Write a protein that binds this ligand. Sequence first.
Ligand SMILES: *[C@@H]1O[C@H](CO)[C@@H](O)[C@H](O)[C@H]1NC(C)=O
Ligand SMILES: *[C@@H]1O[C@H](CO)[C@@H](O)[C@H](O)[C@H]1NC(C)=O
Ligand SMILES: *[C@@H]1O[C@H](CO)[C@@H](O)[C@H](O)[C@H]1NC(C)=O
Lengths: 241, 300
Amino acid sequence: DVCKEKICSCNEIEGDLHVDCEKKGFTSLQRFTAPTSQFYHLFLHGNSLTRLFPNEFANFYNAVSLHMENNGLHEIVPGAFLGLQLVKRLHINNNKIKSFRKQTFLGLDDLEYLQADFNLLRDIDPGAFQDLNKLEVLILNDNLISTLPANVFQYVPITHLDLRGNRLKTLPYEEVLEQIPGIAEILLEDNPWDCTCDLLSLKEWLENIPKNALIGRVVCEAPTRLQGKDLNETTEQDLCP
Amino acid sequence: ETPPRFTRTPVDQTGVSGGVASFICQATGDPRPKIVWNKKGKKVSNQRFEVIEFDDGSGSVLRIQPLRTPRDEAIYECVASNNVGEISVSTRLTVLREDQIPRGFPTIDMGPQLKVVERTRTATMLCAASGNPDPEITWFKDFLPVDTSNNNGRIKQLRSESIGGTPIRGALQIEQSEESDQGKYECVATNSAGTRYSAPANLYVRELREVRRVPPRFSIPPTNHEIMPGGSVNITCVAVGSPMPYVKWMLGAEDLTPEDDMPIGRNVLELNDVRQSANYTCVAMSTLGVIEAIAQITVK
Ligand SMILES: *[C@@H]1O[C@H](CO)[C@@H](O)[C@H](O)[C@H]1NC(C)=O
Ligand SMILES: *[C@@H]1O[C@H](CO)[C@@H](O)[C@H](O)[C@H]1NC(C)=O
Ligand SMILES: *[C@@H]1O[C@H](CO)[C@@H](O)[C@H](O)[C@H]1NC(C)=O
């Protein structure tokens, strides 16, 4: 019914119309509507949207970017984002979403920007982003990602990959690292990197990578033989004797 | 009350097939001038051009992309008009095909890349151009020229002087990143020959990554050793925390590790020809504090 229902503050500037519904205490958005002619940036910050069910945001098809952080979100039923072809930017950080499954991001065809930092994320379905073919920037810092599945970034135009602050032991070239040639910024700092035979691929890759594309350091946390040492200056013999 | 007056007028430009041409025209007056772009009389009307107005309203920019020859050529007119008056300036476009490019035409050796910057930090978009005579660098954000004027501001276009037979730089430095600053940037090299554009580069602005701060802790403490006299021992000292603390080696109050290359996180001490017993003190340092641990070296 917003905005002529006065519920949220849809002030009309600058150059874009911002629908500020931050801290209004929304629990669902199937009961609500949004303007027909104007495109808008939707802000649903601190509203306590605990669960997203199919065909929420259905009347918000004209949204260009969705920003729903600090909602304590944990459950996303597939098709919750359905209808959001226009959206280019999705903020779902600072919640409690424990995993990415396939068809989790169903509906978001144009999506270019994804932020899911601080979410206790662990498992990520291989075919989670496989339809997000415009996803240039993926930000996943401060989570519990143990591993990245084989084909996760196949045909996903990743350019910014923020993977800091996870439980990430290794990163394979085969399928995973080869499939993202277009990187310009990658962040791997704060990970328990296990420098063994399995990390060689990373090392060599970081050599062939565009210069200054890696942001931060990749320090070996293991083994104790190598703890505290940069991958930068790690002889191949030491990784793989 | 007042007539219109040109504050900035478009100048003749030479572009390349499939490239970009931009003409800037802004005026002042009361009531505010209306800017019209005419192509040899009538206003331009096609599916390749685009008029992008200033947020001021002071003027606009004619954006032709991609350049087609000889179709794009040649002359255009900027007309500023209000109730009390009207004024006009003209300018010539030239678009040369791929085999008409001179030696020393502006070329972008390295353009700007995608950039996600945390808010209130520095974001410096890079560019590197080469041409004869040497190209002058200038920037466009979202189809509009970047005001890098001399008057003090965050948005400085760096001299970034690199010497010799190297390319020109001219990087765009953005201090105190804001939500306004994010958008599509484009680098532009311009000399006598003409104008070359770089591929567009998106700038994104995010929030700062909250990092929990921790004082230094010795992950690997300096161990004690007994050695045959004149032997050589290598003691490993490793400390952790956030920010990751420097690791330094001291003998008494004497500093062994040089401040210039003080290692962050890890330091191994190499003791050669030890025929004297001594205690060596490893010291970790960060803005959250300083700690130290002893490694007792005894001689057998
Ligand atoms: C280590 O890493 C960076 C390069 O990104 C820089 O500090 C330095 O050039 C490197 N040192 C080497 C490669 O020895
Ligand atoms: C320790 O000394 C040995 C000689 O025994 C040397 O080969 C090795 O490189 C040294 N360790 C270092 C420099 O970390
Ligand atoms: C090292 O420390 C021990 C115990 O604190 C002490 O007995 C010994 O004299 C010390 N040796 C030195 C300072 O050379």
